[PDB]
Symmetry: D2
Subunit: 324 residues, 4 copies
């Protein structure tokens, strides 16, 4: 016999499958921050890591594995083969690298998505890789999954950054500062001024110039700073990890726990705000165990609606020229 | 009136001195992992970041600041100037770089760090991470002039954390329930205490007398060898180590900030113990509270285990006596 | 030498002052739920319990003490003497039996001076009913500034409202935003204008929201907040879990200096035409100094009238109180 | 078109089976403490409450439901009908009623279990049973016999609270946190529990090695009193507040964490100890068990002294004597 057999008597020995499994595809700067944020929030009972670079993949896995004593996730596995992803509740795509970007990542997704669907056919896909709104469509098209199980990060980080800036401006915690950034993630995002409030008190009601160029306090700058900061962190640090890692983990929480909380995430907007083309844009979504079960019908101004239609038109133009 | 004045009526324009403040010196791979682990464990009400590279420092601070919505730490500040560290309860040194050269290099760095830290937070607890951790904890203690309790070195905390994971894998039991102690000099010269290795109070050395011996048919010595091998393997594979050390440092921070009085394998002034008569810092099980190392566990070591600690102490002192401050 | 001396070497046996201490006065049904909710949220490094009934007080303390292994609060102390409360950051008053005005005042006449004596720089969190009247009583006796005297007020009312709204819409209470303000209890005010999900005003989509002409009768959501309160009392005899969790949430904001907005009772003199020393619930920024700032909610003529009537009613009682 | 339809567009109505469900049977002092501890530890996505007293059950459910804003458990349901328990991963039995004999209590609670257990198995056939109701060691057997579930899916609280109280007392004595103070109380839960002095340590330093008279009557520091106080305290809390809730509530939640999360942590819980320590009868006693998604997958073979072994055999003999006279 052995010391294990000497010390421990076994009752049953079937290698039981996990119940709450999460997969992170692309153990990059973003991917690894999502991983640690998920592990510390105790959202999964099994974490699977997938990457093309086998050496980095093994090292990242081993590093997380050594922290097991301080974690409540008993199984951290990795592999270049997608067999490690089998029966994931949530699969997060943070793969690629920081029109060429579109084309390059589409080819990467051509392999990633069919492999993911092959091992976890009833999973929820959370796309992070940029352009997130275009790649969510790419994933949805390749997977053949229903629109609810294809979730794009979209304006989640944008709204997270907006609520922080608003929070600093007012000297109130971002949790209590309510604001919504919707539409196309990035530069072309839309700040919904009407929805901006603290304790149900509309900021646009108290300050009618809110978001206009006429504004003496320059509140439009709060949205400009969301865009400026993104590029500033890239200029300073070379990458972004912590803010996106935490935001992705927050979405994962609502999904894994079936919380039914409203989040600003990229979804099939076709049929809303006059949009006709198969494009994904960020709107407030109820996130549960089935992904996006319900969508909040935000009342948008003519100006706000126009911007979402223009984003949709722009995004479709690229999407129609894509070879799957 | 501004929209802020229109929306909010002020009772008092604040501001209390920081209450549960933590400072991270060196926003490197290790430093930033300590930062995120501390932020997620809701240990501080204020986090301060210090580095020589201002661009990276500002970037790392801003990135953490954007995640504020998902955090319960209302103030994340940074700066090259140590004025940002003022009134810290715990100051963590993760400064320098990866890799005698590393000793004299990091000693020179500490000659500025430590006096600046003491200047702004004179009643703080120092948590040294930068390598050689055992030597640099002494360096910090000497420069600071702080009592032995307020100078805490990471030491064999990560070593024991890695050991408990490996032991855990071997036995198919969670590392939390697998008890083992790696003590002495952090790194290659660490000591696995085979007498203390247990699960549910059942001594593994009692059941398997060959435990941690050359004749070990199951080769349990490899569990300690793998702790050393893994360290260099992660370095070969990804280029650095962050997550494992980040989590371990946060666990120590928890006992220090919350005054938990939990026992941890950390580097402390081992003079007067195990025949050591020199001013050297080695890892032993320490009770971690609001005053740092208030008490230490007197582990019964074998003549071979004691000899290793004395040899480590002799080696470490040899370097330490030739150091200039 | 003793086994303790043989096993452990001591470096220092000094100081030991509590950095994040919380005190619960009145280990009743409400008090004990506040205690467990605080302990599990890891908000204090020391918990102190005070009561007149010494037997129950010791029993409740010992029970919590046995759970120490599963907690991250190293010191749980109790006593009829307020010496146990010394150096508290937050003191919660859940003392005096449930139904009441003049009775609890006589209880406070001793509780508050004893609390101030041992923790003079603490934040007071009043839970004891009538919460709005007793917050004034505490503020008057303590002599503490407006910010360090916090009343639970409409925190539980809004918590119940957001749950009901949440059920109605099939959305989590966290994402369902609504504000119940004014006098805690029956005379509370639902602010329909502030009611929203993702910044989308429910009153904008449904103009009949919280009126009599509402075919969906959303005015029932507020009625049910009041009805439920009395229903839980009819069914289980008391209320503990809902209030315990709500008090812990306020405690979190205070202890961690979060600066989050909460519906809590504060000195409302100078707002909505109120000229008297009365405490009513308004959205307040909660931190290390308590109520540092308050949100100036735009109220309708009817909403304002209700708050003025509550203020008038509350002052009428308060002016006839002997101090 | 209602305000809900105006505000929210629906993608799917697709209501799925609860993934991480927990059921609490008996919303008493113990039951409700287990409930709040579980809710705050974010272990379930659905909590179901069952009791005979419909009014108290509705009130307890509504009270928890109002706290939903401060919780991460989206569904809190209750009912006298066990249809509410359907698809529960873990079912906890805290259904009982605490100047009566111990034999009156056994058959009293067996009559109660004769309805509870078949109803639980009917709606959640692949669940893990966590027995709390006293005598826990006897009632875990009763549940196992009625359910027909394998040994692993029938978990009794046993000496979990006993060890939790012991580690607190040891912790106070040494001025070290209970987490860092390691000790094991095994065997029959209650008065007849066994303190395993060989396993008593801090940082792997055996206390019995440093102090050989540890736990003996010889003991100059009288460490055996640490175990006596575990028993004395139990009755003292009962004398003082009339019941015990917080300590047991937290302990049950800790077990639930290991089960729900499949942590594979070692816990002192009651399991069938047949063919171990010379016991040949179908009896459940507390030993260190590895708790995962399948319940008790493995058990730690603790080296016991002749005296320690004798106590476990005597407990087993006593427990079987009652168990063989029971009707099912
Ligand atoms: N709010 C949002 O939606 C945000 C999105 N992002 C995006 O996240 C993505 C990832 O960013 P970083 O991690 O910083 O990039 P990176 O360069 O650090 O990491 C990408 C990783 O993916 C791996 N990878 C490449 N091809 C792969 C394949 N076929 N299968 C699996 N793994 C593969 C690479 O080896 C690398 O480890 C980018 O597209 C970036 O723009 C970044 C910030 C915010
Ligand atoms: N168990 C343990 O004790 C472990 C200790 N370590 C050690 O931690 C240390 C840091 O490692 P990494 O972060 O990976 O190195 P790194 O190269 O990523 O980071 C060091 C950082 O310190 C900064 N720095 C340098 N001089 C400074 C000064 N005067 N003031 C402030 N900041 C300064 C650098 O700019 C850099 O950002 C190393 O000495 C390493 O050996 C690593 C792993 C485990
Ligand atoms: N949202 C809110 O503001 C709510 C407020 N409450 C209120 O909380 C209060 C407490 O309720 P329960 O705990 O259910 O009452 P209870 O009858 O269970 O408990 C009150 C406790 O205070 C103790 N006590 C009495 N005089 C004392 C003194 N001088 N010093 C210290 N302790 C003393 C009693 O011995 C008893 O243990 C009531 O006034 C009740 O109306 C209840 C629910 C919600
Ligand atoms: N370490 C351990 O194992 C401990 C076990 N216990 C035990 O826990 C049990 C419960 O204790 P308390 O809650 O204080 O008792 P209690 O009197 O407060 O509560 C028992 C509850 O079960 C309900 N109940 C009765 N018959 C039922 C049935 N057929 N179906 C569903 N519910 C039913 C009652 O209506 C009541 O609400 C007792 O047997 C007690 O000895 C207590 C402390 C520690
Ligand atoms: O989408 C990203 C990706 C981003 C990033 C990465 Cl990871 C890498 C590169 C860039 N940009 C540049 C770098 C060189 O010059 C052209 C493109 C960006 Cl912008 C890092 C980042 O923060 C975000 S979020 C965001 C981006 C723009 C506006 C608003 C928001 Cl919220
Ligand atoms: O102390 C460290 C520092 C270490 C590290 C870092 Cl951060 C960076 C580099 C190295 N290796 C090399 C690099 C060039 O050639 C000589 C040294 C190591 Cl080894 C990375 C690491 O894991 C640990 S912990 C450890 C180290 C050795 C044995 C046991 C343990 Cl627990
Ligand atoms: O203030 C309280 C105290 C309350 C309680 C307690 Cl703790 C004790 C007793 C009662 N009522 C009765 C009991 C029998 O007949 C007379 C008085 C109430 Cl109503 C329990 C409780 O839920 C609240 S909050 C509330 C009260 C009324 C409307 C809206 C809200 Cl939010
Ligand atoms: O099992 C229980 C049930 C217990 C309890 C309750 Cl809830 C109620 C009553 C009693 N005793 C007596 C008192 C009056 O006459 C009949 C029975 C006990 Cl003992 C309360 C309690 O703490 C425990 S744990 C325990 C019990 C005895 C020794 C050691 C431990 Cl760890």
């Amino acid at each position: 016999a052995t010391l294990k057999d000497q010390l421990i008597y076994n009752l049953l020995k079937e290698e039981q499958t996990p119940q709450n499994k999460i997969t992170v595809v692309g153990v990059g700067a973003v991917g690894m921050a999502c991983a640690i944020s998920i592990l510390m929030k105790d959202l999964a009972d099994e974490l699977a890591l997938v990457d093309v670079i086998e050496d980095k993949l093994k090292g990242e896995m081993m590093d997380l594995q050594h922290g097991s004593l301080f974690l409540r996730t008993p199984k951290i596995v990795s592999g270049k083969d997608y067999n490690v992803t089998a029966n994931s509740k949530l699969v997060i795509i943070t793969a690629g690298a920081r029109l060429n970007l579109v084309q390059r990542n589409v080819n990467i997704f051509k392999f990633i998505i069919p492999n993911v669907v092959k091992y976890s056919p009833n999973c929820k896909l959370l796309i992070v890789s940029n352009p997130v709104d275009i790649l969510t469509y790419v994933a949805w098209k390749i997977s053949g999954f229903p629109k609810n199980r294809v979730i794009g990060s979209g304006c989640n980080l944008d709204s997270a950054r907006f609520r922080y800036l608003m929070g600093e401006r007012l000297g109130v915690h971002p949790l209590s500062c309510h604001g919504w950034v919707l539409g196309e993630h990035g530069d072309s995002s839309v700040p919904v001024w009407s929805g901006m409030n603290v304790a149900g008190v509309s900021l646009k009601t108290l300050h009618p110039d809110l978001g206009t160029d006429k504004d003496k306090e320059q509140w439009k700058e709060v949205h400009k700073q969301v865009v400026e900061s993104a590029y500033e962190v890239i200029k300073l640090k070379g990458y972004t990890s912590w803010a996106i890692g935490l935001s992705v983990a927050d979405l994962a929480e609502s999904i894994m726990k079936n919380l039914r909380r409203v989040h600003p995430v990229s979804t099939m907007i076709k049929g809303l705000y006059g949009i006709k083309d198969d494009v994904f844009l960020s709107v407030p979504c109820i996130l549960g165990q089935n992904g996006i079960s319900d969508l909040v019908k935000v009342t948008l101004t003519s100006e706000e609606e126009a911007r979402l239609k223009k984003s949709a038109d722009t995004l479709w133009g690229i999407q129609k020229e894509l070879q799957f």
